Amino acid sequence: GHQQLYWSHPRKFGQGSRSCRVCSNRHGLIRKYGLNMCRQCFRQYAKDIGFIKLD
Amino acid sequence: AIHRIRITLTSRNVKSLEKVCADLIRGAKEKNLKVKGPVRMPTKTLRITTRKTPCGEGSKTWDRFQMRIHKRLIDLHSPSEIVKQITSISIEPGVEVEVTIADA
Amino acid sequence: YTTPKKNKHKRKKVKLAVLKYYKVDENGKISRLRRECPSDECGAGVFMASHFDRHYCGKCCLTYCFN
Amino acid sequence: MAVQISKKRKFVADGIFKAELNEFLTRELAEDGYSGVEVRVTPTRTEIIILATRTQNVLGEKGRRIRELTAVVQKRFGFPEGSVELYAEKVATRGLCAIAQAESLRYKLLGGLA
Amino acid sequence: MLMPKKNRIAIYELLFKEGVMVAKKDVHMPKHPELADKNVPNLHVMKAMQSLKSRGYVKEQFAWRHFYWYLTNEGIQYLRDYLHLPPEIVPATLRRSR
RNA sequence: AAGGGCACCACCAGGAGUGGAGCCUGCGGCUUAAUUUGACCAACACGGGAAACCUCACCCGGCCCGGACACGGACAGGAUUGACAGAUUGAUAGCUCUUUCUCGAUUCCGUGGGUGGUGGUGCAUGGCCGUUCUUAGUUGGUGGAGCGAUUUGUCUGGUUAAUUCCGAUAACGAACGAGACUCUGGCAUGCUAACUAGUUACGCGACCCCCGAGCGGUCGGCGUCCCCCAACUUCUUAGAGGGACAAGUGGCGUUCAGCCACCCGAGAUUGAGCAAUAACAGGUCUGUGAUGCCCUUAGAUGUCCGGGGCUGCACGCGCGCUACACUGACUGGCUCAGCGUGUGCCUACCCUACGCCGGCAGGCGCGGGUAACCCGUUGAACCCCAUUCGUGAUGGGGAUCGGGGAUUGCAAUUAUUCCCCAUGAACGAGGAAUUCCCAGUAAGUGCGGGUCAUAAGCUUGCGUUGAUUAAGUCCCUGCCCUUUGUACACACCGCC
Ligand SMILES: [Mg+2]
């Protein structure tokens, strides 16, 4: 409807307040170190960020 | 001016950190500024353990990713001014430099 | 599906003709037959509603009630 | 201090910037022989170097396209004005770059070669 | 899009001042960050640029969660005669110092 | 079927267990408007899936277009958009109705055509990942054999963790895998460096002894990078280097490849990561603005909002937690860690010292920390030392359940979590079965991270205490190589 109910439901917290910064997914996020990236997207881009495998 | 400055260098790789911490202090010796020795701070090991599969089906294998952050501190102390003397930085990509004074 | 309620009839506007709700007399003497919204955001240009028991400003959305 | 974030978050954010810029350049300069991106960051300013085979093609008419991409990377990450410079560099031995050869193979397959 | 003139011309002149414009994909974003004083919703600017794309005056590139619209030569003259401007003022990407 | 070799996802000798009880959690079933759904060694604390809203994909209702663009109607004499009052609605959704105002070309209607979809199809696909298989295996060129599928190379033997190597040799020369490699742990009183780590020494102090010690003892009390106003790196940190190679000795060996024992040594087998050819109709289209095709697209399978559900219970199963007690529980005192995190682009939500109030959960002010600077010398638990208990379903166990008080949130009922007082239920070591494991290991024990506005019985890591047994075998379950048989080749879950 109008502006009073279109987005009136609070999303200041919870799982619905956070989304993947790459694919806009809402499951398996990684908020550690302010990453804000999906679980799969982090595996996709870890070489680019610099998280490399040692052991 | 009477100045005493601190230069901290941080990055992900020891080779470039060591060569910067070497060439900067060698320039200081050739430019006769007495050098407070390079202090190697403990390494920051950013660890992220994540399930390998994008599905949740399998043998529950976990992939662990590491990021090593190394940082060094060099205090440049001279009886005369320091900043007007040293102006070149000679910094390659990858390493981040921060210069403060004794007040900060 | 098989919705219990019938299809909700969407509102259709009244299709008003030319407004012409103000009149002058004897070769021109102005007569506002509609109330004026006195706020700055309404301004002196727009006219208020003349509902049977209140007045409504189209822009200022002020409602003046007479009992 | 309070204004600057910690070193851990700062390095993670640098990696995020590198990854986002690389993905953007891959999706944009795909047909121009994109190979890679190298960022040299300094407190004074930053230099983004695009390693690509067709430099004369990534640079539009009188640098129109490189100016466009410079403005885009300006506005998306919000650098201070005039603090970012984008250069294009021709790669050496493009046969050794797997990115360029994979892109060329994709171009051929989209064209319709067997 | 029911978006009015008072923000349509604002978006169009932003798009003409520099040959590009960047918009984060957030239809629920209350305000597009630059042109902060025009009260232009992100949904309105996204759909205006989408209409321009459909008419072919701007080309669209999509990274993770952003649009990176690039104005085109077909968009040059359309912006010029929509904003009633003689062909002498150019976008930033076109001419610099020359 | 034979021969040789190997493996705690096999056994042996054992340990801790699970299966028995309660509870948590995940599947099936039942019920339901819905109890959304994938997956059946290699599914079942798995989808990082600890769901009040969101998540959400399910159900019950209600809004909006966020249906681009093109064409035709419609139109400033108005295409059309919002909204006060009453009903109406769950709703202060002008959602619809009565009512008139108001925006002005942005829209409306119709036709093509978009677009979106956690809609279908993983038996159309990509990528990733799991498994075959972490076993040691795999392939080309030229040459030889065969009419050819193919074969030799790629092997009698010895040896190895290993087609690892020595050797033979119709093969020669190679390639991948293994190894090599990277990280990690162990020694460096050797080097460099340290006011964001310290040590020693010295000086102020504070206390005990003062009989008399006095260069006596304690101090995580204050100082000596406050710049002249001590040195040094043993301890901590992290760099460059070294160090271990079956190197030395004895024995065995074709005296080769190597194996066993011993000396000296920190170490004579530290744990991981990476990991071949070929495959599976193994899993994901519910990760993606990865995606073909199909379906839907204005009364929506788009999207938003309210409520409910994903928890629902005659029952079965899986991963776990708590226990059944005296090798213990309670009460008090003493005393020791290491990983690692900490104030946010959106994004609001950080770790907390100290003081005060409260019995507790908590609350109120003052600060510190974007961090070897502050929490923090991380005063952790187990353990240790004393007290009470006394073989009882007992002071073991804390499920169930009542009342009350706080915290988070917009909201706590189907109890979010926490605190207090009551109730002490099964459970007295668990059938048939079955899992994991060889040294700082199992197990006991706590502490970090992820999830997190609130939070862990989960998971990923860390430290503390620290064993019994074994240095073997192919017996069971399997794996590799060679020979052999085959009526199998969807390949013994075969065929008949
Ligand atoms: Mg008691």
PDB file of N, CA and C in Angstrom, chain B residues 20-88:
ATOM      1  N   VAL B  20      61.278  -3.788   3.137  1.00  0.00           N
ATOM      2  CA  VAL B  20      60.985  -2.400   3.489  1.00  0.00           C
ATOM      3  C   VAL B  20      61.662  -2.026   4.803  1.00  0.00           C
ATOM      4  N   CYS B  21      61.529  -2.879   5.819  1.00  0.00           N
ATOM      5  CA  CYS B  21      62.153  -2.593   7.101  1.00  0.00           C
ATOM      6  C   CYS B  21      63.670  -2.589   7.009  1.00  0.00           C
ATOM      7  N   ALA B  22      64.232  -3.174   5.954  1.00  0.00           N
ATOM      8  CA  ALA B  22      65.668  -3.127   5.731  1.00  0.00           C
ATOM      9  C   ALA B  22      66.089  -1.873   4.974  1.00  0.00           C
ATOM     10  N   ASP B  23      65.426  -1.565   3.855  1.00  0.00           N
ATOM     11  CA  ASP B  23      65.880  -0.432   3.056  1.00  0.00           C
ATOM     12  C   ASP B  23      65.603   0.893   3.754  1.00  0.00           C
ATOM     13  N   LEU B  24      64.506   0.986   4.513  1.00  0.00           N
ATOM     14  CA  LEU B  24      64.235   2.215   5.251  1.00  0.00           C
ATOM     15  C   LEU B  24      65.314   2.480   6.297  1.00  0.00           C
ATOM     16  N   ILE B  25      65.682   1.454   7.069  1.00  0.00           N
ATOM     17  CA  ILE B  25      66.691   1.676   8.098  1.00  0.00           C
ATOM     18  C   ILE B  25      68.063   1.889   7.473  1.00  0.00           C
ATOM     19  N   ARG B  26      68.355   1.246   6.337  1.00  0.00           N
ATOM     20  CA  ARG B  26      69.631   1.510   5.677  1.00  0.00           C
ATOM     21  C   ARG B  26      69.703   2.946   5.175  1.00  0.00           C
ATOM     22  N   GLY B  27      68.602   3.455   4.618  1.00  0.00           N
ATOM     23  CA  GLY B  27      68.551   4.864   4.274  1.00  0.00           C
ATOM     24  C   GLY B  27      68.755   5.754   5.482  1.00  0.00           C
ATOM     25  N   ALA B  28      68.189   5.359   6.625  1.00  0.00           N
ATOM     26  CA  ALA B  28      68.386   6.130   7.850  1.00  0.00           C
ATOM     27  C   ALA B  28      69.852   6.144   8.280  1.00  0.00           C
ATOM     28  N   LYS B  29      70.529   4.994   8.209  1.00  0.00           N
ATOM     29  CA  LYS B  29      71.947   4.956   8.566  1.00  0.00           C
ATOM     30  C   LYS B  29      72.784   5.799   7.613  1.00  0.00           C
ATOM     31  N   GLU B  30      72.516   5.706   6.308  1.00  0.00           N
ATOM     32  CA  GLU B  30      73.225   6.552   5.353  1.00  0.00           C
ATOM     33  C   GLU B  30      72.892   8.025   5.539  1.00  0.00           C
ATOM     34  N   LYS B  31      71.742   8.328   6.138  1.00  0.00           N
ATOM     35  CA  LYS B  31      71.313   9.694   6.389  1.00  0.00           C
ATOM     36  C   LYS B  31      71.438  10.038   7.874  1.00  0.00           C
ATOM     37  N   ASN B  32      72.331   9.327   8.575  1.00  0.00           N
ATOM     38  CA  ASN B  32      72.739   9.446   9.981  1.00  0.00           C
ATOM     39  C   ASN B  32      71.622   9.907  10.914  1.00  0.00           C
ATOM     40  N   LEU B  33      70.519   9.167  10.922  1.00  0.00           N
ATOM     41  CA  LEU B  33      69.498   9.256  11.956  1.00  0.00           C
ATOM     42  C   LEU B  33      69.579   7.986  12.789  1.00  0.00           C
ATOM     43  N   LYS B  34      69.825   8.133  14.089  1.00  0.00           N
ATOM     44  CA  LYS B  34      69.965   6.959  14.939  1.00  0.00           C
ATOM     45  C   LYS B  34      68.623   6.244  15.054  1.00  0.00           C
ATOM     46  N   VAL B  35      68.653   4.921  14.926  1.00  0.00           N
ATOM     47  CA  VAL B  35      67.457   4.122  14.691  1.00  0.00           C
ATOM     48  C   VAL B  35      67.154   3.302  15.932  1.00  0.00           C
ATOM     49  N   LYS B  36      65.943   3.459  16.450  1.00  0.00           N
ATOM     50  CA  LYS B  36      65.405   2.521  17.422  1.00  0.00           C
ATOM     51  C   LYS B  36      65.021   1.251  16.677  1.00  0.00           C
ATOM     52  N   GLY B  37      65.470   0.105  17.184  1.00  0.00           N
ATOM     53  CA  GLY B  37      65.425  -1.136  16.445  1.00  0.00           C
ATOM     54  C   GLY B  37      64.036  -1.562  16.018  1.00  0.00           C
ATOM     55  N   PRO B  38      63.952  -2.287  14.901  1.00  0.00           N
ATOM     56  CA  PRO B  38      62.645  -2.736  14.396  1.00  0.00           C
ATOM     57  C   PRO B  38      62.021  -3.750  15.343  1.00  0.00           C
ATOM     58  N   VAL B  39      60.809  -3.451  15.793  1.00  0.00           N
ATOM     59  CA  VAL B  39      60.071  -4.311  16.706  1.00  0.00           C
ATOM     60  C   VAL B  39      59.036  -5.072  15.895  1.00  0.00           C
ATOM     61  N   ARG B  40      59.108  -6.397  15.933  1.00  0.00           N
ATOM     62  CA  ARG B  40      58.204  -7.257  15.182  1.00  0.00           C
ATOM     63  C   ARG B  40      57.062  -7.670  16.101  1.00  0.00           C
ATOM     64  N   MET B  41      55.874  -7.123  15.864  1.00  0.00           N
ATOM     65  CA  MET B  41      54.745  -7.445  16.715  1.00  0.00           C
ATOM     66  C   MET B  41      54.255  -8.861  16.417  1.00  0.00           C
ATOM     67  N   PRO B  42      53.578  -9.499  17.372  1.00  0.00           N
ATOM     68  CA  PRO B  42      53.067 -10.854  17.128  1.00  0.00           C
ATOM     69  C   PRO B  42      52.088 -10.888  15.965  1.00  0.00           C
ATOM     70  N   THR B  43      52.173 -11.960  15.182  1.00  0.00           N
ATOM     71  CA  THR B  43      51.380 -12.083  13.969  1.00  0.00           C
ATOM     72  C   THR B  43      49.903 -12.257  14.289  1.00  0.00           C
ATOM     73  N   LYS B  44      49.057 -11.582  13.517  1.00  0.00           N
ATOM     74  CA  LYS B  44      47.614 -11.748  13.623  1.00  0.00           C
ATOM     75  C   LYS B  44      47.172 -12.817  12.633  1.00  0.00           C
ATOM     76  N   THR B  45      46.620 -13.908  13.145  1.00  0.00           N
ATOM     77  CA  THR B  45      46.216 -15.044  12.323  1.00  0.00           C
ATOM     78  C   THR B  45      44.695 -15.057  12.234  1.00  0.00           C
ATOM     79  N   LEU B  46      44.166 -14.536  11.132  1.00  0.00           N
ATOM     80  CA  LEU B  46      42.729 -14.537  10.890  1.00  0.00           C
ATOM     81  C   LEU B  46      42.339 -15.901  10.344  1.00  0.00           C
ATOM     82  N   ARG B  47      41.540 -16.644  11.098  1.00  0.00           N
ATOM     83  CA  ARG B  47      41.176 -18.008  10.746  1.00  0.00           C
ATOM     84  C   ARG B  47      39.683 -18.077  10.468  1.00  0.00           C
ATOM     85  N   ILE B  48      39.316 -18.687   9.347  1.00  0.00           N
ATOM     86  CA  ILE B  48      37.916 -18.915   9.007  1.00  0.00           C
ATOM     87  C   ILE B  48      37.757 -20.368   8.591  1.00  0.00           C
ATOM     88  N   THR B  49      36.941 -21.116   9.323  1.00  0.00           N
ATOM     89  CA  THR B  49      36.675 -22.514   9.013  1.00  0.00           C
ATOM     90  C   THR B  49      35.260 -22.626   8.467  1.00  0.00           C
ATOM     91  N   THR B  50      35.134 -23.136   7.245  1.00  0.00           N
ATOM     92  CA  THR B  50      33.862 -23.155   6.541  1.00  0.00           C
ATOM     93  C   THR B  50      33.672 -24.518   5.898  1.00  0.00           C
ATOM     94  N   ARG B  51      32.435 -25.008   5.884  1.00  0.00           N
ATOM     95  CA  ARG B  51      32.141 -26.260   5.201  1.00  0.00           C
ATOM     96  C   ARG B  51      32.476 -26.141   3.720  1.00  0.00           C
ATOM     97  N   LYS B  52      33.166 -27.154   3.190  1.00  0.00           N
ATOM     98  CA  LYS B  52      33.560 -27.130   1.785  1.00  0.00           C
ATOM     99  C   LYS B  52      32.350 -27.155   0.863  1.00  0.00           C
ATOM    100  N   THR B  53      31.385 -28.015   1.152  1.00  0.00           N
ATOM    101  CA  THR B  53      30.289 -28.227   0.225  1.00  0.00           C
ATOM    102  C   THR B  53      29.347 -27.028   0.216  1.00  0.00           C
ATOM    103  N   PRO B  54      28.768 -26.694  -0.935  1.00  0.00           N
ATOM    104  CA  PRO B  54      27.669 -25.722  -0.980  1.00  0.00           C
ATOM    105  C   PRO B  54      26.291 -26.324  -0.751  1.00  0.00           C
ATOM    106  N   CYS B  55      26.214 -27.563  -0.272  1.00  0.00           N
ATOM    107  CA  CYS B  55      24.957 -28.297  -0.237  1.00  0.00           C
ATOM    108  C   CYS B  55      24.636 -28.836   1.149  1.00  0.00           C
ATOM    109  N   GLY B  56      25.659 -29.187   1.915  1.00  0.00           N
ATOM    110  CA  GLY B  56      25.449 -29.886   3.161  1.00  0.00           C
ATOM    111  C   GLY B  56      25.400 -31.389   3.038  1.00  0.00           C
ATOM    112  N   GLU B  57      25.589 -31.927   1.840  1.00  0.00           N
ATOM    113  CA  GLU B  57      25.695 -33.360   1.617  1.00  0.00           C
ATOM    114  C   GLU B  57      27.158 -33.741   1.450  1.00  0.00           C
ATOM    115  N   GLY B  58      27.564 -34.806   2.131  1.00  0.00           N
ATOM    116  CA  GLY B  58      28.934 -35.261   2.034  1.00  0.00           C
ATOM    117  C   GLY B  58      29.459 -35.860   3.318  1.00  0.00           C
ATOM    118  N   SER B  59      30.771 -35.778   3.520  1.00  0.00           N
ATOM    119  CA  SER B  59      31.423 -36.365   4.679  1.00  0.00           C
ATOM    120  C   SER B  59      31.816 -35.322   5.717  1.00  0.00           C
ATOM    121  N   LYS B  60      31.222 -34.130   5.655  1.00  0.00           N
ATOM    122  CA  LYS B  60      31.469 -33.049   6.610  1.00  0.00           C
ATOM    123  C   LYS B  60      32.945 -32.655   6.628  1.00  0.00           C
ATOM    124  N   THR B  61      33.440 -32.262   5.461  1.00  0.00           N
ATOM    125  CA  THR B  61      34.801 -31.769   5.338  1.00  0.00           C
ATOM    126  C   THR B  61      34.816 -30.258   5.504  1.00  0.00           C
ATOM    127  N   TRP B  62      35.751 -29.773   6.307  1.00  0.00           N
ATOM    128  CA  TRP B  62      35.865 -28.357   6.612  1.00  0.00           C
ATOM    129  C   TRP B  62      37.146 -27.805   6.010  1.00  0.00           C
ATOM    130  N   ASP B  63      37.025 -26.681   5.319  1.00  0.00           N
ATOM    131  CA  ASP B  63      38.156 -25.978   4.738  1.00  0.00           C
ATOM    132  C   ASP B  63      38.497 -24.812   5.650  1.00  0.00           C
ATOM    133  N   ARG B  64      39.760 -24.724   6.042  1.00  0.00           N
ATOM    134  CA  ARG B  64      40.232 -23.689   6.952  1.00  0.00           C
ATOM    135  C   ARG B  64      41.124 -22.720   6.183  1.00  0.00           C
ATOM    136  N   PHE B  65      40.784 -21.440   6.251  1.00  0.00           N
ATOM    137  CA  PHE B  65      41.503 -20.377   5.569  1.00  0.00           C
ATOM    138  C   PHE B  65      42.220 -19.517   6.595  1.00  0.00           C
ATOM    139  N   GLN B  66      43.458 -19.150   6.287  1.00  0.00           N
ATOM    140  CA  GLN B  66      44.272 -18.326   7.164  1.00  0.00           C
ATOM    141  C   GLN B  66      44.675 -17.046   6.451  1.00  0.00           C
ATOM    142  N   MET B  67      44.791 -15.977   7.228  1.00  0.00           N
ATOM    143  CA  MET B  67      45.372 -14.724   6.762  1.00  0.00           C
ATOM    144  C   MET B  67      46.361 -14.254   7.812  1.00  0.00           C
ATOM    145  N   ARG B  68      47.637 -14.215   7.453  1.00  0.00           N
ATOM    146  CA  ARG B  68      48.680 -13.789   8.373  1.00  0.00           C
ATOM    147  C   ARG B  68      48.952 -12.308   8.153  1.00  0.00           C
ATOM    148  N   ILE B  69      48.788 -11.512   9.203  1.00  0.00           N
ATOM    149  CA  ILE B  69      49.097 -10.090   9.172  1.00  0.00           C
ATOM    150  C   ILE B  69      50.301  -9.861  10.066  1.00  0.00           C
ATOM    151  N   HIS B  70      51.383  -9.359   9.480  1.00  0.00           N
ATOM    152  CA  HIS B  70      52.598  -9.051  10.215  1.00  0.00           C
ATOM    153  C   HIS B  70      52.802  -7.544  10.227  1.00  0.00           C
ATOM    154  N   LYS B  71      53.263  -7.026  11.362  1.00  0.00           N
ATOM    155  CA  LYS B  71      53.518  -5.601  11.503  1.00  0.00           C
ATOM    156  C   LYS B  71      54.813  -5.368  12.268  1.00  0.00           C
ATOM    157  N   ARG B  72      55.490  -4.289  11.890  1.00  0.00           N
ATOM    158  CA  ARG B  72      56.754  -3.879  12.476  1.00  0.00           C
ATOM    159  C   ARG B  72      56.693  -2.401  12.829  1.00  0.00           C
ATOM    160  N   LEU B  73      57.435  -2.036  13.868  1.00  0.00           N
ATOM    161  CA  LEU B  73      57.514  -0.666  14.353  1.00  0.00           C
ATOM    162  C   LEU B  73      58.962  -0.205  14.306  1.00  0.00           C
ATOM    163  N   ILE B  74      59.193   0.977  13.738  1.00  0.00           N
ATOM    164  CA  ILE B  74      60.514   1.594  13.704  1.00  0.00           C
ATOM    165  C   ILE B  74      60.374   3.017  14.220  1.00  0.00           C
ATOM    166  N   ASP B  75      61.125   3.351  15.264  1.00  0.00           N
ATOM    167  CA  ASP B  75      61.106   4.692  15.831  1.00  0.00           C
ATOM    168  C   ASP B  75      62.290   5.473  15.279  1.00  0.00           C
ATOM    169  N   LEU B  76      62.001   6.544  14.550  1.00  0.00           N
ATOM    170  CA  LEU B  76      63.026   7.444  14.046  1.00  0.00           C
ATOM    171  C   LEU B  76      63.177   8.587  15.038  1.00  0.00           C
ATOM    172  N   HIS B  77      64.362   8.694  15.630  1.00  0.00           N
ATOM    173  CA  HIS B  77      64.658   9.709  16.635  1.00  0.00           C
ATOM    174  C   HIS B  77      65.935  10.424  16.217  1.00  0.00           C
ATOM    175  N   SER B  78      65.837  11.729  15.979  1.00  0.00           N
ATOM    176  CA  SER B  78      67.004  12.536  15.673  1.00  0.00           C
ATOM    177  C   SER B  78      66.976  13.828  16.482  1.00  0.00           C
ATOM    178  N   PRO B  79      68.144  14.380  16.824  1.00  0.00           N
ATOM    179  CA  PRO B  79      68.157  15.680  17.515  1.00  0.00           C
ATOM    180  C   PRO B  79      67.548  16.804  16.698  1.00  0.00           C
ATOM    181  N   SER B  80      67.687  16.767  15.378  1.00  0.00           N
ATOM    182  CA  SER B  80      67.108  17.782  14.514  1.00  0.00           C
ATOM    183  C   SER B  80      65.721  17.332  14.062  1.00  0.00           C
ATOM    184  N   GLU B  81      65.146  18.051  13.102  1.00  0.00           N
ATOM    185  CA  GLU B  81      63.843  17.687  12.568  1.00  0.00           C
ATOM    186  C   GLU B  81      63.957  16.402  11.754  1.00  0.00           C
ATOM    187  N   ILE B  82      62.842  15.689  11.635  1.00  0.00           N
ATOM    188  CA  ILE B  82      62.800  14.388  10.978  1.00  0.00           C
ATOM    189  C   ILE B  82      61.978  14.433   9.696  1.00  0.00           C
ATOM    190  N   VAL B  83      60.802  15.060   9.747  1.00  0.00           N
ATOM    191  CA  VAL B  83      59.869  14.995   8.626  1.00  0.00           C
ATOM    192  C   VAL B  83      60.389  15.796   7.440  1.00  0.00           C
ATOM    193  N   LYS B  84      60.984  16.962   7.697  1.00  0.00           N
ATOM    194  CA  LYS B  84      61.549  17.740   6.598  1.00  0.00           C
ATOM    195  C   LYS B  84      62.748  17.038   5.981  1.00  0.00           C
ATOM    196  N   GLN B  85      63.430  16.191   6.753  1.00  0.00           N
ATOM    197  CA  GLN B  85      64.564  15.447   6.223  1.00  0.00           C
ATOM    198  C   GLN B  85      64.106  14.263   5.383  1.00  0.00           C
ATOM    199  N   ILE B  86      63.302  13.374   5.957  1.00  0.00           N
ATOM    200  CA  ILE B  86      62.841  12.190   5.237  1.00  0.00           C
ATOM    201  C   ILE B  86      61.478  12.492   4.618  1.00  0.00           C
ATOM    202  N   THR B  87      61.409  12.406   3.294  1.00  0.00           N
ATOM    203  CA  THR B  87      60.185  12.654   2.546  1.00  0.00           C
ATOM    204  C   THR B  87      59.791  11.487   1.659  1.00  0.00           C
ATOM    205  N   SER B  88      60.762  10.840   1.024  1.00  0.00           N
ATOM    206  CA  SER B  88      60.485   9.658   0.226  1.00  0.00           C
ATOM    207  C   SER B  88      60.069   8.497   1.123  1.00  0.00           C
TER     208      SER B  88
END
